[PDB]
Structures are given as structure tokens and as C-alpha cells.
Amino acid sequence: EMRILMVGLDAAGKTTILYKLKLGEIVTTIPTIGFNVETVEYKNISFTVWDVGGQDKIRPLWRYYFQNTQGIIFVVDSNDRDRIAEAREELQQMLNEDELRDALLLVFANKQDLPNAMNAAEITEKLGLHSIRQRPWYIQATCATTGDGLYEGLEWLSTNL
């Protein structure tokens, strides 16, 4: 019916976020070698999760698992300063996929419990979110392990959908 695509580098906290929603079992599928998909199905909504960044294995086939995406959730480890530039590049490629041009964008600046984590303002500038045109976006500072911030960010995505 409608899909929410939640993607980001490995260890960003996406699986942690799926489990905190308590909207259904997390199911892992491996449609092809090197492509692990995690899926939660709640009513008419499908939450679809996989890791981006690095080799981008089976990238040309991602379109056939993108379909009917109404909102993108980009999750970043705010403490991972080593890979923030990689997260920016991976986000930009998602923002250029034709099947996702109309999808809303929620950004979770995750792991705000860590002492040296970049704040949402810094994450906003590092991701280049203000260069996004004609697409509504929103960024929330979160701690997925406590759940802090997830409701406020998903409140924006849900009310705007």
C-alpha cells in the first residue's frame, strides 16, 4: 500500500529503531547475495531497511525494492565523524533516484547520547539538507536505544503523509 524506506550506513541504529516502534516482527530476507533487507509490516505500511555505503552491492536492483516509497528515513550515527562524508554522498544518491523524487525525507541524527556526537545542526550542514529543493525534509536528534526523539520525528513524517 505504502512503503517507508529507512536507510543509512551500517551501525547507524536502523534495526534498533525498527524494534523500538513495536509495530511488528522484524523479518530478514536475502533476495540476492550481498543484499540483506529487514522488513516490518504494520497494516498498510511496510518499513523497509537495508545498509547503504561502501560497495553498494546490488545497487541497480534497488529500484525493484524502492517501489511505492512515500517517505525516506535517513539514519546517521552522529558520533561517526569518520564516515559522515560517506553518509552525505549516499543520501544524495537516494535523493536522485527517480522513484523517490516525491518521497518525504526524515533524517534521524542518532546516538545523541554519545559525548562527542555531532549535533543536529552540525549534521544538517554536513549532509547538505538545506540544498534540497521542492522536497519537504525534517531532522530530529535521537537516541534509538532510549527511544528519545523518535516520536517527534515520526510525528512529522506521519502528519505530512
Ligand X SMILES: Nc1nc2c(ncn2[C@@H]2O[C@H](COP(=O)(O)OP(=O)(O)O)[C@@H](O)[C@H]2O)c(=O)[nH]1
CA distances (Å), 118 to each of 28, 75, 115, 125, 136, in order?
A: 31, 13, 9, 11, 23
CA dist., res. 101 & res. 41, Å (int): 23
Distance (Å, rounded) from C-alpha 92 to C-alpha 27? Answer: 27
| Cβ at position 104, least distance to ligand X in Å | 20
Q: Any known ligand binding at 8?
A: yes
* 76 lies in the binding site for ligand X (CB under 6 A): no
**Closest separation between CB of residue 5 and ligand X, Å?**
13
3-state DSSP assignment of residue 135: coil
State phi, psi for 31 to the nearest 5 degrees: -60, -30
* Residue 28, annotated as binding a ligand: no
Candidate residues 4, 104, 144, 150; the one interacting with ligand X per rule CB under 6 A: 144
Determine which residue in the list 106, 111, 129, 150 makes contact with ligand X, applying CB under 6 A: 111
* Active-site residue flag, 55: yes
Applying CB under 6 A, does 113 fall inside the site for ligand X?
yes
Q: What interhelical angle do 150-160 and 14-21 show, nearest 10?
A: 80
Please give the residue ranges that form the binding site for ligand X (CB under 6 A). 8, 10-16, 51, 110-111, 113-114, 143-145
Q: Binding site residues for GTP, as ranges?
A: 8-15, 54, 110-113
Catalytic residues: 55
